[PDB]
Amino acid sequence: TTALVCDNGSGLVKAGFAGDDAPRAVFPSIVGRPQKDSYVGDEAQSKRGILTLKYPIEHGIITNWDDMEKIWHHTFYNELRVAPEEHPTLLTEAPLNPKANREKMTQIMFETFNVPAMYVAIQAVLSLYASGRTTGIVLDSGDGVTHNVPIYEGYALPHAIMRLDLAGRDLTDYLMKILTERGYSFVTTAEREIVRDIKEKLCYVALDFENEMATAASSSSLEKSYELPDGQVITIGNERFRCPETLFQPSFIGMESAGIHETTYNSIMKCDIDIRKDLYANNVMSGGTTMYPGIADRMQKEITALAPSTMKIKIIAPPERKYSVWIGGSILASLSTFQQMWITKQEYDEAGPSIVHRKC
Numbered sequence: 001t002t003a004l005v006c007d008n009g010s011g012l013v014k015a016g017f018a019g020d021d022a023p024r025a026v027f028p029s030i031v032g033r034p035q036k037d038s039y040v041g042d043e044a045q046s047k048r049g050i051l052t053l054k055y056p057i058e059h060g061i062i063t064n065w066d067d068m069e070k071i072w073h074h075t076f077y078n079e080l081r082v083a084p085e086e087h088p089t090l091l092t093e094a095p096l097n098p099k100a101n102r103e104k105m106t107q108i109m110f111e112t113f114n115v116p117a118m119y120v121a122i123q124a125v126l127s128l129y130a131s132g133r134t135t136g137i138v139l140d141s142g143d144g145v146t147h148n149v150p151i152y153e154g155y156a157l158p159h160a161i162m163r164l165d166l167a168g169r170d171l172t173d174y175l176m177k178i179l180t181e182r183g184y185s186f187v188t189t190a191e192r193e194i195v196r197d198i199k200e201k202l203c204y205v206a207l208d209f210e211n212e213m214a215t216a217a218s219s220s221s222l223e224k225s226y227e228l229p230d231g232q233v234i235t236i237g238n239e240r241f242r243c244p245e246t247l248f249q250p251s252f253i254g255m256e257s258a259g260i261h262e263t264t265y266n267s268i269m270k271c272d273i274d275i276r277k278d279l280y281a282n283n284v285m286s287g288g289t290t291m292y293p294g295i296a297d298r299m300q301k302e303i304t305a306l307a308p309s310t311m312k313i314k315i316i317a318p319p320e321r322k323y324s325v326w327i328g329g330s331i332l333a334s335l336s337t338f339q340q341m342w343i344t345k346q347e348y349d350e351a352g353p354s355i356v357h358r359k360c
């Protein structure tokens with residue numbers, strides 16, 4: 001029977017059937033409760049006023065299992081409209097996901113949803129498979145968290161994994177702030193959803209930050225107009241490139257951590273010397289926050305400036321990197337040499353949660 005692929009994202013839940021072109025269902029990772037006892041996804045925030053909203057998978061890691069259970073329950077019956085007892089289910093997890101976490105991910109799958117078989121894959125790793133690589137370093141920047149994950153011979157290197165608590169969610173908020181400072185007023189939650197659309201449609205990464213700031217202070221060639229739903233037309237200037245700039249300079253929002261370019265460098269320099277030249281030549285971009293135009297040219301420039309001059313440096317930004325993680329799981333599930341890595345109902349009834357250390 002057709003396997004299931006569910007990418008448990010920090011902001012969006014990508015779910016669908018293994019072997020498909022794209023995930024059939026994409027919805028918010030939010031659980032709302034004060035007509036019913038709970039809501040999940042779009043309608044959870046449509047009625048955000050009467051409910052209490054929950055981000056159980058924010059920052060990449062699942063923290064609440066009652067809410068998560070509601071998200072998975074929403075995925076199976078309401079979105080994909082399948083019987084979880086009739087489908088092997090591949091789950092995804094954030095890098096550096098603790099052991100007891102994937103144990104509990106597995107327990108809930110069998111004891112509560114009764115899956116025939118399941119598996120938990122690291123998100124960044126799947127994105128690499130989707131590119132056609134078993135070796136390389138992935139920059140996974142989603143909604144709630146950004147990870148740098150070096151992968152060698154098809155296996156991620158935990159000690160060199162970098163975690164940056166800065167992603168598109170922080171950027172959206174940042175874009176509201178600086179747009180409000182200019183003279184507008186985007187404060188409400190409904191206005192947040194509007195600003196996020198501006199971010200995805202008009203923002204871009206500046207090749208050189210200061211030079212772009214100068215073109216903005218002296219001309220209006222960088223300015224773009226944006227029509228609000230109520231017909232009102234607003235104008236965005238340097239906020240276009242100042243927004244994603246936070247990924248390289250987290251200090252703009254008080255975050256005293258290294259940028260995505262530096263965390264990439266630091267990640268590689270934690271790996272064994274012999275494979276570093278391979279990581280440099282295979283920098284894969286993953287997640288929606290890496291969708292900014294010009295982010296690859298900026299990454300190319302900054303990594304080069306940090307690395308030896310003799311170093312060959314390549315940046316890979318796939319056009320479908322919004323759904324890289326899910327696609328990677330779709331091919332993994334359909335892979336013949338992977339079938340023996342499933343954890344079956346029988347296997348779990350015999351061993352317990354202790355078996356996920358043997359397969360995952």
Ligand SMILES: COc1ccc([C@H]2OC[C@H](C)[C@@H]([C@@H](C)[C@@H](OC)[C@@H](C)/C=C/C(=O)[C@H](C)[C@@H](C/C=C/N(C)C=O)OC)O2)cc1
Nearest residue numbers: 121122125129130131132133134154155331332335337338
């Ligand atoms: C969607 O477009 C495409 C994407 C990729 C490819 C294809 O390109 C050539 C690649 C050698 C190939 C590889 C990378 C993929 O196979 C389809 C990928 C699924 C293979 C992964 C593995 O072999 C690993 C090492 C093993 C074990 C898994 C370890 N794990 C999950 C650790 O976390 O899985 C059987 O993938 C072809 C088309």
Ligand SMILES: Nc1ncnc2c1ncn2[C@@H]1O[C@H](COP(=O)(O)OP(=O)(O)O)[C@@H](O)[C@H]1O
Nearest residue numbers: 009010011012142143168169200287288289291
């Ligand atoms: N074209 C785009 N430009 C910039 N950001 C985008 C674009 N498309 C989506 N995003 C951002 O990507 C984030 C979604 O990332 P995602 O891959 O779902 O990560 P996660 O699975 O952790 O939520 C959202 O915060 C969204 O604002």
Ligand SMILES: [Ca+2]
Nearest residue numbers: 009123142325
């Ligand atoms: Ca993700």
